[PDB]
Write an enzyme that holds these catalytic residues in place. Structure first.
Site, PDB file in Angstrom:
ATOM      1  N   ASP A 242       5.733  -6.355   3.611  1.00  0.00           N
ATOM      2  CA  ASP A 242       4.998  -7.534   3.144  1.00  0.00           C
ATOM      3  C   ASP A 242       5.987  -8.436   2.399  1.00  0.00           C
ATOM      4  O   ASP A 242       5.985  -9.651   2.566  1.00  0.00           O
ATOM      5  CB  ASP A 242       3.838  -7.141   2.219  1.00  0.00           C
ATOM      6  CG  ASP A 242       2.823  -6.252   2.898  1.00  0.00           C
ATOM      7  OD1 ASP A 242       2.068  -6.704   3.787  1.00  0.00           O
ATOM      8  OD2 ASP A 242       2.784  -5.069   2.538  1.00  0.00           O
TER       9      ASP A 242
ATOM     10  N   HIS B 138      -0.687  -2.421   0.604  1.00  0.00           N
ATOM     11  CA  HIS B 138      -0.015  -2.780   1.841  1.00  0.00           C
ATOM     12  C   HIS B 138      -1.187  -3.033   2.799  1.00  0.00           C
ATOM     13  O   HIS B 138      -1.581  -2.163   3.590  1.00  0.00           O
ATOM     14  CB  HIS B 138       0.874  -1.626   2.340  1.00  0.00           C
ATOM     15  CG  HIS B 138       1.429  -1.844   3.713  1.00  0.00           C
ATOM     16  ND1 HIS B 138       1.874  -3.073   4.150  1.00  0.00           N
ATOM     17  CD2 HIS B 138       1.580  -0.996   4.761  1.00  0.00           C
ATOM     18  CE1 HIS B 138       2.271  -2.975   5.406  1.00  0.00           C
ATOM     19  NE2 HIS B 138       2.104  -1.725   5.802  1.00  0.00           N
TER      20      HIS B 138
END
Lengths: 327, 327
Positions: free
Chosen positions: B160, B188
């Site tokens: 990310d 996540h």
């Protein structure tokens, strides 16, 4: 330093999926060498969309060496000012296809790409053909680019070389990195001839270490020769990651030098060892300053000559089969 | 120096196919650091056979740093004396499966692997969970290994982070390597919160450079949040290579240090920023000598607090859902 333009074909395919990230990581041309990737895929929507996806992933890796990246659907734009080209894309052997069909389909691809390189690439571009049949595809491309130095068209024999290297390390129980002077002759096919007669580990003869010529003939050669099939049998799919690794090794050594160490490269024959001039063939070479040099003076015994003849014959049959598209 | 034992799960899968070769190449622990790979796959014949195929390919790359490699069908042998563990294998969300089903299936996998690590791994093993849901899977493993330091169980938020990094470089037209102090908070998942409020490029505020908060809210956040789906849409399959790259980045930075640069790591909360202790959460950290340190003193404005609340809520719902398997 100034970025190098690297053109890669069949960019949305398997080999490339293991290849592109390592090139962008600096594995191929050095950690201080910025690269610009010019990626090519067939014009089809699905293929171009998939290529867009791969490019998204590469961006998502945040590679500091990646100075640029563009997607193409035409070899004429993809090869523009390219300093290095990796010809990975090729026509796979499908259902109903005979050998002549496979040869022609690939010849049509490589004459076009060879012409494109001839027209727009760097005047001293280094080309490596990975797509099968590699040696013949490289020959077609070379013949199709008359304004470029023939010595700059090479084929990947490095995968056969690395596979031979791993079988020897396994047999001798020695680190793969300690083996010297091992190399492969011929075609990137099961007729390749991995030659361990000069190989040494810490200065000791590998041949004498093993002391069993039957192993060489009935175990070593056939295992390396059929290794790709063994991988397909186990995984269900081709050996993408190790083929990508060998391509990187090939360019890396060619460009940065082997420092005296011998390696294998499929190159246009200059007539050495009685190989007809112009045939792309695996030869033992050393590299320096971006140039290769065939290792001379090796002895060719009866066994070696028969193996060399078999692989040369296969290459000549392939050449005969594409000759008409080279008018 | 002495080789480190690296255990990796789901070794015949996609992420691992892009991951293993780079670890063996020295990308994760350094070019002078030999590694021993202890690979784990489920006991099933097909999976074990495929793992055999991957191992053949790794051997065929002739990596000098690969000091050893073994295949396993039991976590108890796979984690034996492991110095680092990458928990990639997990149960994907199949047809008919509800959220509770996915959570339970994964909890059953991670309680077992956590117990195995607790029993046989190095007393100071570093663990990174990549398999989804990463934060929760890491929490389950951590809770299942009471004899090991909780701080050693981490989850991958680096993908990310890298994706956020690429969107900022693209927007500002600046090199991805010049961006400092960017980081991600939370899970996540699409509820992650990429925070660009402190980010700088050559000493200039990124937020002020863009000068458009609407871009931040309606373009930046949603794009990074849905990036994985965009890749599946384009490629037809998941983002294996970039996820593998992020895992390498995570371990590399953790072990070798960030030299003052901030990065994102999913770690057990120590209570900083009002995050309940023990929740595996993405926090901005700096690393040194194999240890991480949460960056303190950041301002949390109203927008940030609402985003943090959303991602924390999702993590708490997941935790509630696996609590019963942690008896």
């Amino acid at each position: 330093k100034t970025p190098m333009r690297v053109a890669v074909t069949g960019a949305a395919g398997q080999i490339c999926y293991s290849l592109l990230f390592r090139i962008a990581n600096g594995d191929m041309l050095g950690k201080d060498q910025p690269v610009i990737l010019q990626l090519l895929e067939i014009p089809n929507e699905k293929a171009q969309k998939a290529l867009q996806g791969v490019m998204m992933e590469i961006d998502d890796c945040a590679f500091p060496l990646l100075a640029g990246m563009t997607a193409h659907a035409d070899p004429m734009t993809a090869f523009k000012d390219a300093d290095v080209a990796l010809l990975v894309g090729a026509r796979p052997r499908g259902p109903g296809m005979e050998r002549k069909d496979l040869l022609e389909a690939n010849a049509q691809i490589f004459t076009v790409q060879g012409k494109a390189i001839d027209a727009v690439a760097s005047r001293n571009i280094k080309v490596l053909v990975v797509g099968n049949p590699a040696n013949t595809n490289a020959y077609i491309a070379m013949k199709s680019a008359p304004s470029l130095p023939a010595k700059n068209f090479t084929a990947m024999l490095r995968l056969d070389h690395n596979r031979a290297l791993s079988q020897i390390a396994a047999k001798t129980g020695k680190p793969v990195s300690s083996i010297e002077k091992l190399f492969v002759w011929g075609n990137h096919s099961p007729t390749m001839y991995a030659d361990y007669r000069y190989a040494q580990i810490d200065g000791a003869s590998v041949k004498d270490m093993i002391n069993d010529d039957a192993w060489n003939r009935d175990t070593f050669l056939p295992t390396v020769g059929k290794r790709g099939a063994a991988i397909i049998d186990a995984r269900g799919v081709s050996s993408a990651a190790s083929a990508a690794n060998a391509a990187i090794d090939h360019i890396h050594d060619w460009v940065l030098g082997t420092a005296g160490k011998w390696t294998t490269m499929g190159i246009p024959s200059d007539g050495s060892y009685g190989i007809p001039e112009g045939v792309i063939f695996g030869f033992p070479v050393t590299t320096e300053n971006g140039e290769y040099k065939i290792v001379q003076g090796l002895s060719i015994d009866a066994f070696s000559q028969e193996r060399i003849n078999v692989t040369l014959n296969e290459l000549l049959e392939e050449q005969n089969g594409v000759q008409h598209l080279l008018g």
